[PDB]
Amino acid sequence: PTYGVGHQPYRVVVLSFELLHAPATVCGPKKSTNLVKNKCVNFNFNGLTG
Amino acid sequence: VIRGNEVSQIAPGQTGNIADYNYKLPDDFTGCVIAWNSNKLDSKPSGNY
Amino acid sequence: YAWNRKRISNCVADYSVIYNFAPFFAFKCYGVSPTKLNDLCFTNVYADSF
After folding, report:
1. Which residue in A10, A11, A25, C9 has the most C-beta neighbors within 10 A?
2. CB distance from B39 to chain C under 8 Å?
3. Dist CA C5 CA C46 (whole Å)
4. A13 contacts in chain B (CB < 8 Å)
């Protein structure tokens, strides 16, 4: 405990995100909306907006 | 758990001792690195070995 | 106002032992990178302490 701030221990947690084309299994708390077709709308398919 | 000088080595493209022999990150890394001090929990007066 | 200047010449420089002498966080390097200081070399190196 008597060392300086450059030699003190640090805890490191590294989060790695997988941007593959697999079906998504880790997704946030946003709710879903019923699907509508043949109408110019805005969509959000697993984070892909348009 | 690493030292304070080696936090900058946990990054894409970095080299050194931890980045070469302990933990290497890819150059196309997409993610987050979280680091905080743990001097009260991971230290001992007689030594944390 | 009276900063020192030490001339370093005619020696082999190892920059990986700097981290053991002083408890700092990281280098602040301009023009070069702190991890690439061993694969290239200079003519004269100074050191100013204040």
Report:
1. A10
2. no
3. 6
4. 33-35
